[PDB]
RNA sequence: UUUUUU
């Protein structure tokens, strides 16, 4: 009643202040961007396959702007469709590049750049050709060699370009799932999400990306938010429920599924083990004002839409509201349950400045507890006996000790 | 600011 307006202030401040400014928008700084489609001349999966050899290589070389990576591999994700512009179109519209879209040309009376021409209509360009299919030296290998390893053109003629192309561009998202959060695990963390497409066979050995070109790619997608942008806004207005979804489209849902909530570590693990478990502990005073701030984040994710995974990883405006250091006594004690519940947890980084070391004992404590981390809120729903009560105390006394053992906060 | 897992 009279405590309403203070309890309801973290969700109406949040709508009150989070209202965007609205009216005309002035146009910042932009970079200009080359992205090469391939037109219809091309019809050759091997030069398709080079040409997506050339973007992922021109995409990791140092020498060039980050821009230009990020519009070389651009260019590699347009080329998994057949319209690529309509792609850049629908999911290239940013403020942070202007997207060039030169056309890659095969013509069969020219053998002096492999073929290949690159034109804008009538006009066609020699000088962005040369430099574009002209001898460049790789810093590091493409992709990783192997012996016995079977080679990309008896993989290409055996499965698709299709298939040859989708292992690459595919690679590049896996990429995309740490490199903006996780930048030092990026590399075990590439190899760790792309186990998965090995072993189903969506990336063969011969087009696994090698470390140095996963760590190239991905800082230019620290670098390039527009890149960034657009993976994110394809994975957001691709038409997932229609069936008619392409491998690649497919994998890349996959890969996006993994993508998403990235940033949102803590916010997503703060409601699953601070809230979500449900203990005695919620009913402190520490927690009540943070639960409120958590209560308006999952209304401000809520009303993001499709769009709320991926607010960190996109620098969104609400995205720093979302950081733990707002309801940093709600975040130490879900850390603590979490760091107890869940081994993954424990190498999560919970040492930071603003961890109530009291707060995360405490959830290691009631995490740890038999009497703490059993609810009477089920109990009526699964008809528990008093037998089975105490034989659920039993089992629990013996698969864990709990003696006085706590977790230390993991550094970062 | 980020940092685990999937």
């Given at each position: ?51 997506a050899?050339?973007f992922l290589?021109?995409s ?12 070389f591999l651009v260019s590699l994700l347009?080329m ?88 690459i561009i595919?690679?590049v ?240």
């Amino acid at each position: 009643g009279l405590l309403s307006t203070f309890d309801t202030f973290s969700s109406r401040r949040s709508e009150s202040i989070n209202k965007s400014g609205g009216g005309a928008v002035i146009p910042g700084q932009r970079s200009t961007v080359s992205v090469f489609v391939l037109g219809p001349s091309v019809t050759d999966d091997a030069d398709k396959l080079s040409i997506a050899t050339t973007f992922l290589a021109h995409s990791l070389d140092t020498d060039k702007q980050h821009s230009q990576r990020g519009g070389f591999l651009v260019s590699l994700l347009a080329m998994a469709y057949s319209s690529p512009e309509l792609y850049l179109t629908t999911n290239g519209v940013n403020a942070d590049v202007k997207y060039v879209i030169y056309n890659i040309e095969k013509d069969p009376k020219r053998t002096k750049t492999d073929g290949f021409i690159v034109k804008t209509r009538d006009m066609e360009y020699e000088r962005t050709t040369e430099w574009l299919f002209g001898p460049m030296v790789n810093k590091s290998p493409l992709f990783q060699g192997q012996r016995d390893a079977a080679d990309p053109d008896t993989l290409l003629q055996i499965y698709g370009y299709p298939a040859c192309l989708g292992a690459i561009i595919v690679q590049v998202w896996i990429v995309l799932v740490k490199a903006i959060t996780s930048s030092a695990g990026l590399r075990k963390g590439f190899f760790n999400r792309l186990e998965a497409f090995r072993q189903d066979g969506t990336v063969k050995g011969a087009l696994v990306f090698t470390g140095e070109t996963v760590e190239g790619i991905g800082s230019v997608m620290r670098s390039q938010q527009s890149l960034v942008s657009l993976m994110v806004e394809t994975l957001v207005t691709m038409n997932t429920a229609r069936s008619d979804l392409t491998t690649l489209e497919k994998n890349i849902q996959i890969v996006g599924n993994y993508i998403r909530d990235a940033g949102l570590a803590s916010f997503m693990n703060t409601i699953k083990y601070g809230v979500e478990t449900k203990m005695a502990a919620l009913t402190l005073s520490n927690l009540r004002p943070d639960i409120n701030k958590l209560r308006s984040l999952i209304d401000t994710y809520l009303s993001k839409g499709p769009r709320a995974p991926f607010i960190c990883i996109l620098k969104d405006p609400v995205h720093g509201e979302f950081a733990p250091g707002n309801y940093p006594a709600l975040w130490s004690y879900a850390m603590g349950v979490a760091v107890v519940q869940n081994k993954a947890m424990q190498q999560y980084v919970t040492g930071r400045t603003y961890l109530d070391m009291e707060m995360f004992l405490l959830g290691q404590a009631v995490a740890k507890d038999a009497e703490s981390k059993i609810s009477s809120a089920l109990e009526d729903e699964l008809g528990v006996t008093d037998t089975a009560k105490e034989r659920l105390r039993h089992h629990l006394a013996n698969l864990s000790g709990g003696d006085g053992a706590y977790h230390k906060p993991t550094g970062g």
